[PDB]
Coordinates of N, CA and C and ligand atoms in Angstrom, one line a residue:
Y1 N 1.8 23.5 3.7 CA 0.2 23.6 2.8 C 1.6 22.4 1.8
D2 N 2.2 21.5 2.2 CA 2.3 20.4 1.6 C 1.8 18.8 1.2
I3 N 0.3 19.0 0.2 CA -0.5 17.7 0.0 C 0.5 15.8 1.0
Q4 N 2.0 16.1 0.0 CA 2.7 15.1 0.3 C 3.2 15.0 1.1
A5 N 4.1 15.7 1.8 CA 5.0 16.1 2.5 C 5.3 15.2 3.9
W6 N 4.3 14.0 3.6 CA 3.8 13.1 5.2 C 4.9 12.0 4.8
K7 N 5.0 11.4 3.4 CA 5.5 10.7 3.2 C 7.2 10.6 3.6
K8 N 8.3 11.4 3.3 CA 9.0 11.4 3.3 C 9.4 11.8 4.7
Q9 N 8.1 12.5 5.9 CA 8.5 12.9 6.8 C 8.0 11.2 7.9
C10 N 7.4 10.2 7.3 CA 7.6 8.8 7.4 C 8.5 8.2 7.2
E11 N 8.8 8.6 6.2 CA 9.9 7.5 6.0 C 11.8 8.0 6.5
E12 N 11.6 9.4 7.0 CA 12.8 10.0 7.7 C 12.0 9.1 9.2
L13 N 10.9 9.4 10.4 CA 10.9 8.1 11.4 C 11.1 7.1 11.6
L14 N 10.8 6.8 10.2 CA 10.8 4.9 10.3 C 12.1 4.9 10.6
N15 N 13.4 5.1 9.3 CA 14.7 5.1 9.7 C 15.3 5.5 11.4
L16 N 14.4 6.8 11.9 CA 14.9 6.8 13.1 C 15.0 5.8 14.0
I17 N 13.5 4.7 14.0 CA 12.8 3.9 14.7 C 14.0 2.5 14.1
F18 N 14.1 2.2 13.5 CA 15.1 1.2 13.1 C 16.1 1.2 13.6
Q19 N 16.7 2.4 13.8 CA 18.1 2.6 14.3 C 18.5 3.0 16.0
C20 N 16.8 2.8 16.6 CA 16.3 2.6 17.9 C 16.7 0.6 18.3
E21 N 17.7 1.1 19.3 CA 17.8 -0.3 20.1 C 16.6 -1.2 20.3
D22 N 15.0 -0.1 21.1 CA 14.3 -0.4 21.1 C 13.5 -1.2 20.3
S23 N 13.7 -0.4 18.8 CA 12.5 -1.6 17.9 C 12.4 -3.2 17.4
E24 N 13.4 -3.5 17.3 CA 14.8 -4.5 17.7 C 13.5 -5.7 17.6
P25 N 12.3 -5.6 18.7 CA 12.0 -7.1 18.4 C 10.7 -6.4 17.8
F26 N 10.3 -5.5 16.9 CA 9.2 -5.2 16.2 C 9.4 -5.0 15.0
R27 N 10.2 -5.2 14.0 CA 11.1 -4.8 13.2 C 10.4 -6.0 12.2
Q28 N 10.3 -7.2 12.3 CA 9.9 -7.8 11.6 C 8.5 -8.2 12.5
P29 N 7.8 -9.2 11.5 CA 6.9 -10.2 11.7 C 7.5 -11.3 12.9
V30 N 6.6 -11.5 14.0 CA 6.9 -12.3 14.8 C 6.9 -13.3 14.4
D31 N 8.1 -14.0 14.8 CA 8.0 -16.5 14.1 C 7.2 -16.9 15.2
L32 N 6.5 -17.6 14.3 CA 5.4 -18.3 15.1 C 6.4 -19.1 15.4
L33 N 7.3 -20.0 15.0 CA 8.1 -20.2 15.7 C 8.5 -20.4 17.0
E34 N 8.7 -19.1 17.4 CA 9.0 -18.9 18.7 C 7.9 -18.6 20.0
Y35 N 7.0 -18.3 19.3 CA 5.4 -17.8 19.3 C 4.4 -18.7 19.1
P36 N 4.1 -19.5 19.3 CA 3.7 -20.5 18.5 C 1.8 -20.5 18.7
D37 N 1.6 -20.0 19.7 CA 0.2 -19.5 20.1 C -0.3 -17.9 19.3
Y38 N 0.6 -17.5 19.0 CA 1.0 -15.9 18.8 C -0.8 -15.3 18.1
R39 N -0.9 -16.6 17.0 CA -2.3 -16.2 15.9 C -3.4 -16.6 16.6
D40 N -3.4 -17.3 18.0 CA -4.8 -17.7 18.5 C -5.0 -16.1 19.0
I41 N -4.1 -15.0 20.0 CA -4.6 -14.4 20.2 C -4.4 -12.7 19.6
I42 N -3.6 -12.8 18.7 CA -3.9 -11.5 17.8 C -3.6 -11.7 16.4
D43 N -4.9 -11.3 16.1 CA -5.9 -11.5 14.4 C -5.0 -10.5 13.6
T44 N -4.5 -9.5 14.1 CA -3.8 -8.7 12.8 C -2.3 -8.2 13.3
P45 N -1.3 -8.8 12.3 CA 0.3 -9.1 13.0 C 0.3 -7.8 12.6
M46 N 1.6 -7.4 13.2 CA 1.7 -5.6 12.1 C 3.2 -6.4 12.8
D47 N 4.3 -4.7 11.7 CA 5.3 -4.8 12.7 C 6.4 -3.6 11.3
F48 N 7.5 -2.9 11.5 CA 8.0 -2.4 10.9 C 8.4 -2.4 9.3
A49 N 9.4 -3.2 9.2 CA 9.2 -3.4 8.0 C 7.7 -3.8 7.0
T50 N 6.7 -4.0 7.6 CA 5.4 -4.6 6.7 C 5.9 -2.7 6.5
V51 N 6.1 -2.0 8.1 CA 5.0 -0.4 7.5 C 5.9 0.3 6.9
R52 N 7.3 0.3 6.7 CA 7.9 0.7 5.8 C 7.8 -0.2 4.4
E53 N 7.0 -1.1 3.7 CA 7.1 -1.9 2.4 C 5.8 -1.7 2.1
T54 N 5.2 -1.2 3.2 CA 3.5 -0.7 2.5 C 4.0 1.1 2.0
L55 N 4.1 1.9 2.6 CA 5.3 3.1 2.7 C 5.1 2.8 0.8
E56 N 6.6 2.0 1.3 CA 7.2 3.1 -0.5 C 6.9 1.4 -1.7
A57 N 5.8 0.6 -1.4 CA 5.0 0.3 -2.6 C 3.6 1.2 -2.6
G58 N 3.5 2.7 -2.3 CA 2.4 3.1 -2.5 C 1.3 3.1 -2.1
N59 N 1.3 2.4 -0.8 CA -0.2 1.9 0.2 C -0.7 2.1 1.0
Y60 N -0.7 4.0 1.7 CA -1.2 4.7 2.5 C -0.9 5.7 1.5
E61 N -2.1 6.3 1.6 CA -3.1 7.6 1.3 C -2.8 9.0 2.3
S62 N -2.4 8.2 2.8 CA -2.4 9.0 4.6 C -1.5 8.8 5.6
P63 N -0.6 10.2 6.4 CA -0.5 10.0 7.8 C -1.1 8.6 8.2
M64 N -2.4 9.2 8.4 CA -2.8 9.0 9.4 C -3.2 7.3 9.8
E65 N -3.3 6.9 8.0 CA -3.8 5.0 7.5 C -2.1 4.8 8.5
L66 N -0.3 5.2 8.3 CA 0.5 4.4 9.0 C 0.3 5.1 10.4
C67 N -0.1 6.1 10.6 CA -0.2 5.9 12.8 C -0.9 5.0 12.8
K68 N -1.8 4.4 12.8 CA -3.1 3.6 12.8 C -2.2 2.5 12.5
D69 N -1.4 1.6 11.5 CA -0.2 0.5 11.4 C 0.6 0.7 12.6
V70 N 1.4 1.4 12.7 CA 2.2 1.4 14.1 C 2.4 1.5 15.0
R71 N 0.2 2.2 15.8 CA -0.3 1.4 16.8 C -0.7 0.5 17.3
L72 N -0.6 -0.4 15.6 CA -1.1 -2.2 16.0 C -0.1 -2.7 16.7
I73 N 1.6 -2.1 15.9 CA 2.4 -3.0 16.7 C 2.0 -2.3 18.1
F74 N 2.1 -1.6 19.1 CA 1.8 -1.8 19.9 C 1.1 -2.2 20.9
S75 N -0.9 -1.6 20.1 CA -1.4 -2.6 21.3 C -1.9 -3.8 20.3
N76 N -0.4 -4.7 19.7 CA -0.6 -5.9 19.4 C 0.3 -6.7 20.6
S77 N 1.8 -5.7 20.9 CA 2.8 -6.0 22.5 C 1.9 -6.1 24.0
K78 N 1.2 -4.7 23.7 CA 0.4 -5.2 25.1 C -0.6 -5.9 25.1
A79 N -1.1 -6.4 23.5 CA -2.2 -7.7 24.1 C -1.4 -9.2 24.5
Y80 N -0.7 -9.8 24.1 CA 0.5 -9.9 24.2 C 1.3 -10.5 25.1
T81 N 1.5 -9.4 26.0 CA 2.4 -9.4 26.9 C 2.4 -10.8 28.1
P82 N 2.4 -11.5 28.5 CA 2.5 -11.8 29.8 C 2.3 -10.8 31.4
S83 N 2.9 -9.5 31.1 CA 3.0 -9.1 32.0 C 3.4 -7.4 31.6
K84 N 2.6 -6.1 32.2 CA 3.1 -5.0 32.0 C 4.3 -4.7 32.0
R85 N 5.2 -5.3 33.3 CA 6.3 -5.2 33.2 C 7.6 -6.3 32.4
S86 N 6.7 -6.7 31.4 CA 8.0 -7.8 30.3 C 8.9 -7.0 29.8
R87 N 9.8 -7.5 29.2 CA 11.4 -6.2 28.6 C 10.7 -6.3 27.6
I88 N 10.0 -6.5 26.5 CA 9.7 -6.7 25.3 C 8.5 -5.6 25.4
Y89 N 7.8 -5.2 25.8 CA 6.1 -4.3 26.3 C 6.8 -3.8 26.8
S90 N 8.1 -3.5 28.1 CA 8.2 -2.5 28.0 C 9.0 -1.2 27.0
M91 N 10.0 -2.0 26.0 CA 10.7 -1.8 24.9 C 9.5 -0.5 24.2
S92 N 8.4 -1.3 23.3 CA 7.2 -0.7 22.7 C 5.9 0.7 23.7
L93 N 6.3 0.4 25.0 CA 6.3 1.2 25.6 C 7.4 3.0 25.4
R94 N 8.2 2.6 25.5 CA 9.3 4.0 25.0 C 9.3 3.9 23.9
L95 N 9.3 2.9 22.8 CA 9.4 3.1 21.2 C 8.0 3.7 20.9
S96 N 6.7 3.8 21.6 CA 5.1 4.5 21.5 C 6.1 5.7 22.1
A97 N 6.3 5.6 22.9 CA 6.1 7.7 23.3 C 7.1 7.9 22.4
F98 N 8.0 7.6 21.7 CA 9.1 7.9 20.4 C 8.1 8.7 19.4
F99 N 7.7 7.8 19.2 CA 6.4 7.7 17.7 C 5.5 8.7 18.2
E100 N 4.9 8.7 19.2 CA 3.6 9.5 19.1 C 4.7 11.0 19.5
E101 N 5.8 11.6 19.5 CA 6.3 12.6 20.2 C 6.7 12.7 18.3
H102 N 7.0 12.0 17.9 CA 7.3 13.0 16.2 C 6.6 12.7 15.5
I103 N 5.4 11.6 15.7 CA 4.7 12.2 14.6 C 3.2 12.4 14.8
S104 N 3.0 13.8 15.7 CA 2.5 14.5 16.4 C 2.2 16.0 15.1
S105 N 3.8 16.0 14.0 CA 3.6 17.0 12.9 C 3.4 16.8 12.7
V106 N 3.8 15.2 11.8 CA 3.1 14.7 10.4 C 1.8 15.2 10.7
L107 N 1.1 14.3 11.8 CA -0.2 14.2 11.5 C -0.7 16.1 11.0
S108 N -0.3 16.9 11.7 CA -1.2 17.8 11.8 C -0.8 19.2 10.7
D109 N 0.6 18.7 10.1 CA 1.2 19.0 9.1 C 0.1 18.9 7.9
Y110 N -0.4 17.6 8.1 CA -0.8 16.9 7.3 C -2.2 17.5 6.7
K111 N -2.8 17.1 8.2 CA -4.6 17.9 8.2 C -4.4 19.4 8.1
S112 N -3.3 20.4 8.1 CA -3.8 21.6 7.8 C -4.0 21.7 6.2
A113 N -2.5 20.7 5.9 CA -2.5 20.9 3.9 C -3.5 20.7 3.7
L114 N -3.9 19.6 4.0 CA -5.5 18.9 3.2 C -6.6 19.9 3.4
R115 N -6.7 20.5 4.6 CA -7.6 22.1 4.3 C -8.1 23.3 4.0
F116 N -5.9 22.7 3.6 CA -6.2 24.7 2.7 C -6.6 24.2 1.2
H117 N -6.4 22.5 0.6 CA -6.1 22.1 -0.5 C -8.1 22.7 -0.7
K118 N -8.2 21.8 0.6 CA -10.6 22.2 0.0 C -11.2 23.3 0.8
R119 N -10.1 24.4 0.3 CA -10.5 26.0 1.5 C -11.7 26.1 0.7
Ligands
UXJ201 C1 6.5 -8.3 18.8 C2 7.0 -9.3 19.4 N1 8.6 -9.7 19.5 N2 8.9 -10.0 19.7 C3 8.5 -11.3 20.1 C4 6.6 -10.8 20.3 C5 5.6 -10.6 20.9 N3 5.2 -9.5 21.2 C6 5.6 -10.1 23.2 C7 6.2 -10.7 23.4 C8 7.2 -11.1 25.0 C9 6.0 -10.0 25.7 C10 6.1 -9.3 25.1 C11 5.2 -8.7 23.8 F1 4.9 -8.1 23.3

């Protein structure tokens, strides 16, 4: 029933993601000195610190918006990887599976609470 509960649920999930070793390449914006052509390939960079800061600033209205940005981290990894077997892309696949497994109930609970609110 709680329309606001998603926010703390997303903070807790982001805390788990930051503890997870697989998130290391995704915690901060990609450094252009390390990957000089990054912006030639990726139009909209995204990383977990930016997601956490957007959430803490009160700049997400729903968990769907946060999901869209987290999914952008993973699609940017798939777009920039030179191979489906690269280290960083393999880490992104595992982290994405972990994220999707945990975000499902957050999204479901929010959409149910909102449908109850508008009944
Ligand atoms: C993100 C990010 N973190 N660290 C480097 C990058 C750039 N992306 C990337 C690079 C190589 C293989 C696979 C990839 F997705």
